[PDB]
Amino acid sequence: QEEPKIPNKCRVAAWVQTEMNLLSTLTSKRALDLPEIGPDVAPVEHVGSERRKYFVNEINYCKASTVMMKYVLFHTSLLNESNASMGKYKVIPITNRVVNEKGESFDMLYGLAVKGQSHLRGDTDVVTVVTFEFSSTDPRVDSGKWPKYTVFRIGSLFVSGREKSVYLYCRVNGTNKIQMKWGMEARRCLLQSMQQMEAIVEQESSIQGYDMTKACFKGDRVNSPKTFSIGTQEGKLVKGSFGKALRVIFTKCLMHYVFGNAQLEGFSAESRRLLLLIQALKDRKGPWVFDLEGMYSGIEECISNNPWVIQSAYWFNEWLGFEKEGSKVLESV
Amino acid sequence: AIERNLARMSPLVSVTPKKLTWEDLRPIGPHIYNHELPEVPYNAFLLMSDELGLANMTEGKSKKPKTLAKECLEKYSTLRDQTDPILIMKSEKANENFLW
Amino acid sequence: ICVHLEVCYVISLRPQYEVIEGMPRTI
Amino acid sequence: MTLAKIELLKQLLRDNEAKTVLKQTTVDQYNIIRKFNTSRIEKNPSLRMKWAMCSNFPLALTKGDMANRIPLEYKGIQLKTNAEDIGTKGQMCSIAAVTWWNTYGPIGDTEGFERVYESFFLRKMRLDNATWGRITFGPVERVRKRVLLNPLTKEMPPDEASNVIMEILFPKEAGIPRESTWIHRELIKEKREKLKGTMITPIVLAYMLERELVARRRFLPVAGATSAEFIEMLHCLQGENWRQIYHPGGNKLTESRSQSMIVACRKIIRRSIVASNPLELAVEIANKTVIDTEPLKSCLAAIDGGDVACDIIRAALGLKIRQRQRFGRLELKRISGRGFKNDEEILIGNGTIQKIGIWDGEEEFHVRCGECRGILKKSKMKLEKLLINSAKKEDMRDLIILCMVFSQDTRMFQGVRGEINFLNRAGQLLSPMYQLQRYFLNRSNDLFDQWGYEESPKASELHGINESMNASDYTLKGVVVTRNKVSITKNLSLIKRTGEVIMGANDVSELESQAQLMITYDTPKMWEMGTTKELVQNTYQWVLKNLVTLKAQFLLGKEDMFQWDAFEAFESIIPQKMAGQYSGFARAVLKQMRDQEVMKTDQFIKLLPFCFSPPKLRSNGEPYQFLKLVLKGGGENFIEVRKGSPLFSYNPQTEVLTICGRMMSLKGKIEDEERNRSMGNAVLAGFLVSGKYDPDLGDFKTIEELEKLKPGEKANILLYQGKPVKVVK
Amino acid sequence: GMNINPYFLFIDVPIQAAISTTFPYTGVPPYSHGTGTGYTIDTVIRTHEYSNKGKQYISDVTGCTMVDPTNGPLPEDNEPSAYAQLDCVLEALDRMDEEHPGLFQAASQNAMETLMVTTVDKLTQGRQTFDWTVCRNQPAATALNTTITSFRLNDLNGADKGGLIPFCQDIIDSLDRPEMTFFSVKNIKKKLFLIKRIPMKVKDKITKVEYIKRALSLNTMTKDAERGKLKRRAIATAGIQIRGFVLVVENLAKNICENLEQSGLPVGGNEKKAKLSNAVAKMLSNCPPGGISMTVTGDNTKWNECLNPRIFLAMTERITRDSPIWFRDFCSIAPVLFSNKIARLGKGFMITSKTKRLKAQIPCPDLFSIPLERYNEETRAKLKKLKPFFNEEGTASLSPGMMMGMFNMLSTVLGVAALGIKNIGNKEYLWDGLQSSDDFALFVNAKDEETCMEGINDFYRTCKLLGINMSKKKSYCNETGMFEFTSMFYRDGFVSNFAMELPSFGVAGVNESADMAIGMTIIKNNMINNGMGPATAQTAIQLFIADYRYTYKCHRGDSKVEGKRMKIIKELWENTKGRDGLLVADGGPNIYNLRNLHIPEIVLKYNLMDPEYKGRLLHPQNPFVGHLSKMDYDAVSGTHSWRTKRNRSILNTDQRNMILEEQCYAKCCNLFEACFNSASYRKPVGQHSMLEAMAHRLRMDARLDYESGRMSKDDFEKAMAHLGEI
RNA sequence: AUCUGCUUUCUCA
RNA sequence: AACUGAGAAAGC
RNA sequence: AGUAGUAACAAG
Ligand SMILES: *O[C@H]1[C@@H](O)[C@H](n2cnc3c(N)ncnc32)O[C@@H]1COP(=O)(O)OP(=O)(O)OP(=O)(O)OC[C@H]1O[C@@H](n2c[n+](C)c3c(=O)[nH]c(N)nc32)[C@H](O)[C@@H]1O
Ligand SMILES: Nc1nc2c(ncn2[C@@H]2O[C@H](COP(=O)(O)CP(=O)(O)OP(=O)(O)O)[C@@H](O)[C@H]2O)c(=O)[nH]1
Ligand SMILES: [Mg+2]
Ligand SMILES: [Mg+2]
């Protein structure tokens, strides 16, 4: 009986922070293909549509939305090919539909995929997908980021007078039917991102007596725009707009899907147990612990090689340091 | 019975309550700061921020993914016709020849 | 019960009397 | 097809395995073999559907001519599988086959769909013939209540509905003719005649009938509208922060209108009593109150019923008072009497002590039930007399039972011997009297057993009756059978021209119940009729918005800043007993903050609303002292003077005020010196800070000890966990 | 270079208000792979190590190694302990009875009445039951039917009485049979290379002790799609013999729980939220003035491992004190069966040669047939620790613990009884809690924090006395006002956690119309009671329609998507004049919004459909919906209410004999339903044979047809002849 | 005054 | 080789 | 190889 391969213990990789920063940034293209919705009649429906305008205009023009749509479409096509061609090697192009501010529609080809034998009788049975994806990033910049990828240099492109090298990242990845199905359903990452923020808007409305979506996003004559603690720049807390926070939460949910496995589930559960204690501390509830090191070990056993979990631990430590500073501010009372 | 057994129960059986202070909240997972460990590699199914999508303006007519990819490669004929593998990086157990 | 059923049967293609006794409740 | 079925049975018995299955298996065990399944069913239907849709022929056809109409291939698209494997295999088709049928297939009859799904068509009709008001953004307190999901015209218990369905659809194999088969004979016959010309599957018809009859009740969060026509739109009606005014279509039962009217009148009176000149405010609100889609005045005029609150509002509005009451199936009219309700630890027959509502004093009611009438005279927990008229036996029994329960006779309470639940599975308080009524309606034998029997009247007209509903030689004790303008005071007291109060605001039931219909208040101050949490949040939001002006007036003015409409509305949720003490305590604390340099803005906001009622100081002229100011409604509705509260918490670090779950910011209205300022000067009325925890003084002194201190006497006060201080008078 | 830190959202929004962000339920739930034997052996070892200090003996009935931690030495440390004290449990039950006078008597009366009116059909309400005749997992109905047939072979006809009591009497009598003969299923292996396994049903016979072990055997497997846990766990399924009495025990415990103010069961959803909110409000209002109230959010570690079926037997006897002796014995059976429960270790372990590229499956009976050095370190240690309790036939003796945990209600009763003490030694603290099966939320009111912690420590020790092990790692305490109970996060009120119901937002995968209705209703209910605002509700509608169109390939008719269904959809779009009435499945537009989420799609579009399309869609005889049988009834549902056969194909396995038996039963049931149309709606009762009922029904129908003139005289003669020969 | 038939999915335990 | 209990939803 | 993670798939 062969020893099980334990997930490796890896350190924080700076590329996860870069992924979070770039996926939250506003691009110029729309990938969401949200279908029509029946005409509004009730004032509740009109309020919902008005709020959706802001929320989607924030999320829709973000790189995370394009990545999510690419994942959804590719997993749909991959499941279709796997069931249609179980005993054939199929080329499944990595494709997406994008729309810019001008309404122009573009077909985006991010690469090709080879769908090997896919006699996926079981739900967890694995089909190997060989992905040849175009990119502009030079792997040598962050070699530690690309030990799984064979990268060639196939040409160049001119987004403008500038010249950008093009590389072909080749990786023999794999996936099962469950992963394909949940990829076809990655659109839910929108809802969890919207609801959390939408609730906040609703809260503000109850404090102001009127719909506060425009005030929260842009700020009206009576209310300044909502600003959230979005991140850090040179060790100083930075403030982002409401839409930036919405995009950050949407990116967090998209990464939950992309890097979601047992490690992330366990880390989420245990770190939530710890987050509740931190909140009790912030509320001056005088929380008492019984075995804190045991809870910490439960949290830490889930941090092995999931990039999102490792970066979440790093962000948790940073946020905990900031909360400790805030408590230091609170002590003088 | 309960009071009797509690009296004769070992004192070592305690819930060990401890008032929580911010100092007790050490950073979680210190090993991730260990530079002796490898950086967590990129293991996502597809490239998220490094993705390069070749763009092809459409005409409101989605024929097929195969034809879409063919047209997009035809627009960027320089990349399609590249038959010279300029290997930049290689995975240890991969076969750059077979991959190309 | 046996005597009652015997009397009912003695009392009894198209029989004049259908029997409701000597059968389960549901039937 | 009896002959064909017999031939099929013989054919099946020709098979030994089927023969033994039929012979050995009993009728009860059929239900087991009906579920026989050798291969376990898969457990990821979503994945299975996504997998099958990406295949050729996932759908299964039904053998017949209609399946033959589907072409094998349509424009190169193979709709259905080839038929070269007919032998004991089956047939399959693609979703493209379904689309082809919808495009070019035969045009069938839709009458069956209209009949079966008439419930959903009525739902659509209610939605379409409905009007929408305006969406209001503000706090909404939703209570989890067991409400009916969909409207019904005849709701019956599930077993009764099942028997009715069996009679309608399966008259032959229906079993024993039960009480339901008789009391619903008309409906059963009507449905049978209506369903006579139908070829729809009997099981589908049965489910249609149960949807039409069986009532689906679920626990849902509701806010002022529990009628099923509103529950079906609950998702759009309101949330935790917004409320959509909705007017459903279709006809509404007058019972819901009466219940909503009672709730509206009770809310109006509760909000008006604290107001100066309560009559004027009550009239003003009632003139702008709409029950679902009709004004409150019209509902009061057109409803021959209500309660004390409805009568008070009618008198205020000019309508005559209808001194009528409803106690379930029993309808009563107060001929004369007077009684003040109290909570009594009544001992029930099965050894249960309950805080039941007990009335006192002589009271006479013209009572009626079904088609029977009578006169009930009662006193505190006793039925003095009950003169009933001749009517049907069942109606007379119902009237007698309901009058016994209404009189709250001690024998009636002692007559409970069985399972009676006065608390729902969710811990919510069920009405004790109605539960007793429900128990005694069915298990009525013990009530008459314990009531006692005396000699039947021998008078000229009075003849008594017994449990058989006949003029027996012995009558029920206190029961006999016979064959034979107001003015309203400023304080909402109904007085006869003689000078006697007949009803008052204090006589209005304090119960706060959700309205059956949606009560709207077409006034700018429509939030003043909300629940405790809504009122608290709105009042504190008003304080925050006007915090600058309130604080400026407080520093400059002396007494004119304590009187506001918002605080008047907030007073309606402070109990009258503690309102004056709270006002005195809060005013003293605010004045002590102002006179000294200690001004905790959070404490000023917290205590300001309570400084509305006239102060009621202690006998020595010093204000009362409180740790928590308890507000009306719910155990968690209170304000902590020192600690945070579920309704009011302050975070100095972020200067964030969490009120009823909503976070406002005091950043901008604050002084940086306030954080360093001590909380000990804004906790006890007439107390300032002198130093830290002094061991010599002793242990922390409680409110009772603190109130008894002398001037200049130091003591230990624990502001909250981990924060002790030393205070002086 | 600003770096985005999502946790900084918590600097503004409190954790509970943003708790939904802490649930990664948009990702794939973890799935177990391969064998579950490792986890089963782990749970066996954990149970026995938590009960090892107890009394170890050998069962004279089965020969298995039994461990009894009850009444054992009190634990001297904080490790999971199964050494429950009978005196302490009985004292807790007496305290609860004093708190609730007559509660036990009423619960016992209700359970006994339900048992007296309960039928054997109640045993068909299970997903997968350990069928002892085939020693596998079979659907509960299949296992029950096979058990009944085997009992018939053994002259055990109590099931024929129609009640659960006689069938359970047969169950306990079968243990006394010297040998049990039953219908098993074997398979012939044909080499074609491929080893095709053709199964056939034969007759087998086993001894008394083997049958006893099988009846007491629990079949173990691995749970799939579990969320929130790093490591996979094992689950177990019982047989009919155990479930029969577990039903009654669970019903009694449920009757008890429904009348306990500190129980989170059987209430759920909004009812549970109301109960918990009321309890929290009461405990907040009952805080002594100036005192400190502290809430402990606590989880119990190794709940099933440490719970002892002997303690549950004691609880059953204490509860059913006033019941007739027959009911007391009936309720005692289930804890007795679970105290002698045997665990089937599963599929065994796979041993592989990497250089030779070979793998083989060593089954549990052959687990020790190879040197332990050929297993990995963890498996080697697990097998070494399992050996004393290992049974040569390939099972493990698991007398302690509640591996299956089928006593959720009874365990809740035990936890509440633990909560009922409320004080020890008249100290200055009072605790009252909320108790689900194992999760709990304690509330201790005292004069200061020190006394609150004293009370919490006393509660911990008392739970240890009752066999309950509060998890110090996962449990924490704060001031009353914030806590968590059964993943419900209370912060001055239960906040809305929108992520938990997120996984159900997708296409339910039943059929097009059913999935449409399910998605719309899920959106509606999440709006009602999960904090989903109108904007998020409309976005959810959009996303559901997108997923629906990409699942059923029913994109908008005017869209440019291409597919086998899409060509006909476009043809329908061109043909249709009232395009707004076309269903989404037929490429029609989506007219759903918030106001009409509660109206079915066809009803919503009924007045917008074209008459031609409406008639084609709502054809009473459309072939895509299963009909009942021309004489076939009219299927009212539309063409989209179709069914995809749930094809349970197994590679290299042609279950023709099993399918034949299933189809024989199906034919008999179909004929019976044709004779008795009410069978589908109302369950047909009767102790007589199905053939007798069908014959009498057909005779009456034929006589009525003859008298009424429906049937000809010659046809009536034919019917009478056929019935006579029947 | 609302309390006094099963199957499947999701969540929780 | 997808268990137990509870809740909601859908279908028969 | 890879997916994945305490044990599996990489067809039978
Ligand atoms: O829905 C609640 C309440 O609004 C509703 N109700 C009450 N009255 C009516 C009328 N007249 N029409 C329609 N609906 C009505 O029934 C529920 C009662 O809740 P609650 O408000 O708590 O009732 P209350 O607190 O008043 O006590 P309750 O015993 O239920 O009596 C309600 C009603 O009956 C009168 N009443 C009862 N009893 C036993 C009385 C008595 O002994 N003596 C006198 N004088 N009156 C008695 C109550 O006073 C109310 O009139
Ligand atoms: N029969 C089942 N019971 C379950 C299941 N999930 C939870 N539970 C019950 O709830 C209890 C909680 O188990 P958890 O899944 O939380 C196990 P966890 O590792 O978190 O706790 P410990 O390892 O016992 O400390 C468990 O003991 C069972 O009694 C399940 O899938 N099946
Ligand atoms: Mg847990
Ligand atoms: Mg818990």
Side-chain angles (χ1 to χ4, degrees), chain D residues 255 258-259 262-263 266 305-308 324-327 334 339 341 357 359 363 365 378 405-408 431 433-434 509-511 513:
Chain D
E255 220 305 67
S258 182
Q259 195 277 349
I262 294 165
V263 172
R266 290 181 185 181
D307 62 324
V308 177
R324 276 189 56 179
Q325 310 180 1
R326 175 183 145 280
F327 189 66
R334 204 177 196 176
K341 189 176 189 173
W359 304 83
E363 294 179 357
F365 303 89
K378 67 168 289 183
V405 178
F406 184 89
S407 59
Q408 303 180 307
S431 185
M433 298 309 309
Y434 281 95
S509 179
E510 299 295 350
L511 175 59
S513 58

Side-chain angles (χ1 to χ4, degrees), chain A residues 269-270 273, chain E residues 226-229 299-300 438-439 474 487:
Chain A
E270 305 295 320
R273 220 176 301 273
Chain E
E226 165 170 320
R227 311 190 90 101
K229 256 302 308 181
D299 306 322
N300 290 289
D438 66 314
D439 193 6
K474 297 185 176 187
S487 291

Side-chain angles (χ1 to χ4, degrees), chain A residues 193-209:
Chain A
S193 75
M194 279 186 60
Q195 193 276 351
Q196 178 55 42
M197 299 305 292
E198 191 198 6
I200 299 170
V201 176
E202 287 177 322
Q203 299 280 100
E204 249 58 16
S205 302
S206 52
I207 303 169
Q208 301 294 341

Side-chain angles (χ1 to χ4, degrees), chain E residues 491-521:
Chain E
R491 175 187 180 84
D492 299 329
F494 289 100
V495 306
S496 68
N497 183 6
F498 178 79
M500 280 191 301
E501 266 55 9
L502 197 62
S504 63
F505 268 77
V507 175
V510 37
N511 62 66
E512 282 170 313
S513 61
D515 287 323
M516 191 74 175
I518 290 165
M520 297 300 119
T521 306

Side-chain angles (χ1 to χ4, degrees), chain A residues 39-248:
Chain A
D40 304 328
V41 173
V44 57
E45 298 177 335
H46 290 78
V47 167
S49 300
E50 276 287 2
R51 194 168 301 170
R52 267 192 309 155
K53 290 167 190 168
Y54 296 88
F55 274 74
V56 175
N57 172 83
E58 281 296 348
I59 287 174
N60 198 9
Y61 283 100
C62 90
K63 188 68 173 294
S65 290
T66 303
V67 175
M68 181 192 66
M69 291 309 310
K70 180 178 67 175
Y71 270 86
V72 170
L73 299 176
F74 184 81
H75 279 291
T76 303
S77 59
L78 179 56
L79 192 74
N80 184 28
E81 283 292 356
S82 297
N83 188 225
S85 310
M86 297 192 302
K88 288 182 286 298
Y89 299 163
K90 289 294 196 181
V91 185
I92 314 183
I94 307 169
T95 56
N96 195 8
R97 187 84 108 189
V98 117
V99 190
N100 70 327
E101 300 290 0
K102 310 176 186 179
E104 305 171 357
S105 182
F106 307 96
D107 294 333
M108 307 298 291
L109 183 68
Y110 302 92
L112 302 179
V114 196
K115 192 286 304 182
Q117 182 205 313
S118 64
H119 290 98
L120 302 174
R121 287 183 305 278
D123 294 319
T124 53
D125 287 3
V126 175
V127 53
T128 291
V129 186
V130 194
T131 62
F132 306 89
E133 287 163 295
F134 309 113
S135 181
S136 292
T137 293
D138 182 10
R140 282 82 62 81
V141 175
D142 203 0
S143 63
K145 184 182 182 183
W146 310 105
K148 298 186 185 302
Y149 288 82
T150 302
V151 181
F152 301 94
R153 209 275 191 171
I154 56 173
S156 299
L157 297 174
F158 283 9
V159 64
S160 58
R162 311 297 177 174
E163 180 266 13
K164 281 191 298 187
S165 298
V166 171
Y167 303 84
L168 183 78
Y169 288 59
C170 322
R171 180 184 162 188
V172 178
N173 203 322
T175 179
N176 57 30
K177 283 197 299 188
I178 298 286
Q179 287 173 292
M180 298 179 213
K181 152 175 174 302
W182 281 87
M184 296 179 61
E185 296 170 316
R187 290 186 188 90
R188 302 177 194 168
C189 296
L190 296 163
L191 306 180
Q192 187 176 7
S193 75
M194 279 186 60
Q195 193 276 351
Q196 178 55 42
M197 299 305 292
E198 191 198 6
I200 299 170
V201 176
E202 287 177 322
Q203 299 280 100
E204 249 58 16
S205 302
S206 52
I207 303 169
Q208 301 294 341
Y210 67 93
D211 186 3
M212 276 288 293
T213 306
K214 182 185 174 182
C216 285
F217 281 95
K218 316 305 180 185
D220 58 3
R221 301 187 191 87
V222 291
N223 289 77
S224 56
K226 286 284 290 187
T227 57
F228 293 81
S229 299
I230 202 74
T232 36
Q233 190 166 197
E234 296 299 307
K236 185 181 179 178
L237 199 66
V238 177
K239 302 285 287 192
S241 61
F242 187 98
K244 181 63 181 179
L246 174 63
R247 290 193 301 276
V248 167

